[PDB]
Design a protein around this nucleic acid. Structure first.
Ligand SMILES: Nc1ccn([C@H]2C[C@H](O)[C@@H](COP(=O)(O)OP(=O)(O)OP(=O)(O)O)O2)c(=O)n1
Ligand SMILES: OC[C@H]1O[C@@](CO)(O[C@H]2O[C@H](CO)[C@@H](O)[C@H](O)[C@H]2O)[C@@H](O)[C@@H]1O
Ligand SMILES: [Ca+2]
Lengths: 553, 415
DNA sequence: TGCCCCCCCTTCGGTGCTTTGCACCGAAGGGGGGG
């Protein structure tokens, strides 16, 4: 006698009726294998046959299981999902082995036909109707409705996932010495008990789950390490990811590159130093999914660097709450950053990488702060606390940055680590004008229609310049005019512009930019020793600003 | 045996569907302990995924408080909950609360748990407690009584609240009492010793209802000592070319607020093309223009007044060295109040703490002065603010904010 | 030729000030992974 799993109330969206999609043609090899599986569901009571009063229907198909001889029955409920009410998914994330604490006893379980062991909402089973051809549509055929959670309905995961928690709820409260990682039907159960007292509680759990209609077959019962869990391998003291297959094809399409970068991102959690910048840079463009791309010289070297990392098998360690968390970031160049999280040296819990390029103009300090924030969120997800940071930036470099930035920025408790390349500011603008430096009154202008423009400067020493520009904008000339001032000036120069656009970019001290002009301006600023920038309003009769605005307009 | 006040949403709006953000270990342990005790007392109940609504939840510690306090980010629900001013349950704002020498704030939100909630409205108060490392799927809850942090809780409870405060307001007619969300602002002009005595009386006056986070804490405000930060022109003798350039840039911006400001006689001092550090004297016409402009900055801005139907908006400017300036307005350049903060907690070491502290200071002033919370324009990146602000938040309310990135081309509020 | 969740990389359209150019951002579609 099994206790009923309480039905979850399910409704349709207001003013919407059930689905009527009929059925697409199916090949005979699939039609035959389907009728055998459906008869098994009628036997166990998971599917009823009566439905002449049912005008609804949903298409059905079948694909095999992952490397198994059993076909998996699926139903295209995309029309039902549009008309079904919205659910709030109780699955908030994915568990990670780097957050696990070492246990003396470990067991892995998997409920059999998990979706089919939970009773569906009574009033909703009429909308799960579906037809299957008997013999190539010669005879009408057998119609059915689902009495349990089907596969393909958008509410099936969330309903089973919350129902699974209600069944485990009395077991976990009455056994606080046990840790249960539930992810759909996959069950990780670990404790510091004698692995015999563990086998007892495991069998107690097996019966407790069997007391609610959930079978735990021995084919999916894992008792001996290594435990294959969530795509990893769990050893008693270390963990590692399941083997990675790198396609070694000599003719790369767009879809091959997409599969490559995807697996490199997946491996970058434990394999340190994975780069995908030059490889993904081949993917940028409006190319079709089949177009063949020749690997560039930098992308081929980067692919070779990743092969060397994946040759040697790498492992991670488990989480000790009694020790602090340490996060150490290294700069890889070209906006790429890798990091490791560990508690004891050379024993990484997990690695990762941050190569996100946000903004048209940035610097290494911003990218490092973005990397620290990505790590902080990840650590709070996995361990619920912020790690101590080891950053390749000197305290003086950071202090100079955050105190002078106009935006509020901050990094948690961190210490400097002299691991080159170090992060530094490549130039810094003076806060006050430079005595003895030539003052460059700078301005530009462009015609909105002809896209022609001029940009130049006038200094206090009589120096002047105007340069005509073609296929340009007002913003470019304003940048171009500052660039001229930097080129024709000494090591120390005062530059007075009226461009709010250009001054906002430069004052953020970028060292890299998507604009060729900004990079040339960056290159000039690094060569200089003292640069003072100042803004004045236009059309107010100010200094050389009125003189240079006439020369460019 | 208390009938529930039926509550509806604004027509044409759904319920809140906001995802739960990650929580630290200490906050999850605090919420699980609190959400277990609230489940024993029937104030909350577990729900399933069939409830399509969700609202973030986390815990805070008020100033000088060692015990945790559950806080729900009902910002999305309050915007979608019917304004109770149309139901006439709105609380009028006393214009004298800002004039009292002392104002004590009391967290009376625990009394809201005694009043049930409309059954057809409980599904909108759904929240989900996360699990560390996603060990367990989301454990979803919903409210059965008046939840803390919802704008309808003080409106429904105000009918009961006016009765509990009747004997104290009559024995002390000079004391102004204002209610905003979970807080009670009590202001008097007495001596600080006699003020705290009347505050302690008000605490024990509420215990007489409790028998028929906790109430023991109180925070002292002094709105009569609040000062404003005006736009100021620096006093110099030898002005360099760059000095006058910055001044003209500042005055030109200020002309958008004070239309009487002129710069014609100061701009003509910048006629030539001189080096930025060259000292230049002040002409006779420019001496009057600068003196006349200072007088315009003394007098108030014409036609600035608070519109109770308009949203308040607050901008903040990080000035460095622990200095922070802010302005509260409803229409652009028509500022209702300008101010400056200094030596706040986190000065010279943590900007996000100071910015979080300044947002709390500004919001508290807006509640005392107008009974509203302004929408903030925060000088910070989105991810930088979303990562740390919950670690330094100490209030029971949460204002609305957007993020800006305006470089300081003209130092306008601070020299 | 199904469902739900998490991650990164690229693209594209909407939004608001740098303004009618340029910058930022969230959604979406590609990939990886899990059940
Ligand atoms: N491609 C997949 C794989 C899984 N699942 C969902 C539905 C299953 O109920 C659940 C668990 O997957 P299983 O492979 O374990 O399937 P059952 O648990 O359904 O069967 P088995 O007896 O093989 O365990 O995950 C899915 O929707 N699509
Ligand atoms: O920081 C904004 C951030 O918060 C989210 C979810 O946490 O939305 C919350 O904050 C918004 C900004 O005020 C509110 O409008 C909303 O009601 C509230 O849930 C995200 O939308 C956003 O990324
Ligand atoms: Ca299974």
């Amino acid at each position: 006698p099994i206790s009923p799993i309480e039905t979850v109330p399910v409704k349709l969206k207001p003013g919407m009726d059930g689905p009527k999609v009929k059925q697409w043609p199916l090949t005979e090899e699939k039609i035959k294998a389907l009728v055998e599986i459906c008869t098994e569901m009628e036997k166990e009571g998971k599917i009823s046959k009566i439905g002449p009063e049912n005008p609804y229907n949903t298409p059905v198909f079948a694909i095999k299981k992952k490397d198994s001889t059993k076909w998996r029955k699926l139903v295209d409920f995309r029309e039902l999902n549009k008309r079904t009410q919205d659910f709030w998914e109780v699955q908030l994330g994915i568990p990670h082995p780097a957050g696990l604490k070492k246990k003396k006893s470990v067991t892995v379980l998997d409920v059999g036909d998990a979706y089919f062991s939970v009773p569906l909402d009574e009033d909703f089973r009429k909308y799960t109707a579906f037809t299957i051809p008997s013999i190539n549509n010669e005879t009408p055929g057998i119609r059915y409705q689902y009495n349990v959670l089907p596969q393909g309905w958008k509410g099936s995961p969330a309903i089973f996932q919350s129902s699974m928690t209600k069944i485990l709820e009395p077991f976990k409260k009455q056994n606080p010495d046990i840790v249960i990682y539930q992810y759909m039907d996959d069950l990780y159960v670990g404790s510091d008990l004698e692995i015999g007292q563990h086998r007892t509680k495991i069998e107690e759990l097996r019966q407790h789950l069997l007391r609610w209609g959930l079978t735990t077959p021995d084919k999916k019962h894992q008792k001996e390490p290594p435990f294959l869990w969530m795509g990893y391998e769990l050893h008693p003291d270390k963990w590692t990811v399941q083997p990675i297959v790198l396609p070694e094809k000599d003719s790369w399409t767009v879809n091959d590159i997409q599969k490559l970068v995807g697996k490199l991102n997946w491996a970058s959690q434990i394999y340190p130093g994975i780069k995908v910048r030059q490889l993904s840079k081949l993917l940028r463009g409006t190319k079709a999914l089949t177009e063949v791309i020749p690997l560039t010289e930098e992308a081929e070297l980067e692919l070779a660097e990743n092969r060397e990392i994946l040759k040697e098998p790498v492992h991670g360690v488990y989480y000790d709450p009694s020790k602090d968390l340490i996060a150490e970031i290294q700069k890889q160049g070209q906006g790429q950053w890798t990091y490791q999280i560990y508690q004891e040296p050379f024993k990484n819990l997990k690695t990762g990488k941050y190569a996100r390029m946000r903004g048209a103009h940035t610097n290494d300090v911003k990218q490092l702060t973005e990397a620290v924030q990505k790590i902080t969120t990840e650590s709070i997800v996995i361990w619920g606390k912020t790690p101590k940071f080891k950053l390749p930036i000197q305290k003086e470099t950071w202090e100079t940055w955050w105190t002078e930035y106009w935006q509020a920025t901050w990094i948690p408790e961190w210490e400097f680590v002299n691991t080159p390349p170090l992060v530094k500011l490549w130039y810094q603008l003076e806060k006050e004008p430079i005595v003895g430096a030539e003052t460059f009154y700078v301005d530009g202008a462009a015609n909105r229609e002809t896209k022609l423009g001029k940009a130049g400067y006038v200094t206090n020493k009589g120096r002047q310049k105007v340069v005509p520009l073609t296929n340009t904008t007002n913003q470019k000339t304003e940048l171009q005019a500052i660039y001229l001032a930097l080129q024709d000036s000494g090591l120390e120069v005062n530059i007075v512009t009226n461009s709010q656009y250009a001054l906002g970019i430069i004052q953020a001290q970028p060292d890299k930019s998507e604009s060729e002009l900004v990079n040339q301006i960056i290159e000039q600023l690094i060569k200089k020793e003292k640069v003072y920038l100042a803004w004045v309003p236009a059309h107010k009769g100010i200094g050389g600003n009125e003189q240079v605005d006439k020369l460019v307009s | 045996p208390i009938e529930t006040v039926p509550v509806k949403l604004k027509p044409g709006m759904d319920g809140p569907k906001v995802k739960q953000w990650p929580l630290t270990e200490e906050k999850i342990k605090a919420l699980v302990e609190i959400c277990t005790e609230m489940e024993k007392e029937g104030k909350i109940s577990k729900i399933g995924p069939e409830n399509p609504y969700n609202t973030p939840v986390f815990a805070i510690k008020k100033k000088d408080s060692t015990k945790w306090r559950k806080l729900v980010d009902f910002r999305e629900l309050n915007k979608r909950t019917q304004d109770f001013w149309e139901v006439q349950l709105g609380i009028p704002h006393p214009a004298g609360l800002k004039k009292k020498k002392s104002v004590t704030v009391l967290d009376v939100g625990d009394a809201y748990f005694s009043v049930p909630l409309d059954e057809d409205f409980r599904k909108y108060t759904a929240f989900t407690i996360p699990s560390i490392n996603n060990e367990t799927p989301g454990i979803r809850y919903q409210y059965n009584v008046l939840p803390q942090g919802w704008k309808g809780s003080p409106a429904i409870f105000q009918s009961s609240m006016t009765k509990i405060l009747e004997p104290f307001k009559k024995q002390n007619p000079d004391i102004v009492i204002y209610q905003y969300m979970d807080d009670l602002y009590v202001g008097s002009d007495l001596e600080i010793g006699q003020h705290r005595t009347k505050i302690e009386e008000l605490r024990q006056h509420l215990l007489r209802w409790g028998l028929t986070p906790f109430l023991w804490m109180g925070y002292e405000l002094h709105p009569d000592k609040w000062t404003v930060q005006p736009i100021v022109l620096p006093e110099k003798d030898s002005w360099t070319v760059n000095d006058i350039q910055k001044l003209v840039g500042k005055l030109n911006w200020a002309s958008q607020i004070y239309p009487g400001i002129k710069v014609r006689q100061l701009s003509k001092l910048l006629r030539g093309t001189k080096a930025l550090t060259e000292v230049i004297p002040l002409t006779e016409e420019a001496e009057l223009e600068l003196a006349e402009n200072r007088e315009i900055l003394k007098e108030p801005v014409h036609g600035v007044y608070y519109d109770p139907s308009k949203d308040l908006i607050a901008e903040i400017q990080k000035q460095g060295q622990g200095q922070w300036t802010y302005q509260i307005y409803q229409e652009p350049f028509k500022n209702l109040k300008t101010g400056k903060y200094a030596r706040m907690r986190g000065a010279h070491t943590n900007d996000v703490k100071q910015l979080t502290e300044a947002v709390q200071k500004i919001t508290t002033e807006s509640i005392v002065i107008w009974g509203k919370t302004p929408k903030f324009k925060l000088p910070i990146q989105k991810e930088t603010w979303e990562t740390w602000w919950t670690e330094y938040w100490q209030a029971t309310w949460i204002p609305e904010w957007e993020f800006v990135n305006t470089p300081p081309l003209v130092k306008l509020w601070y020299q």
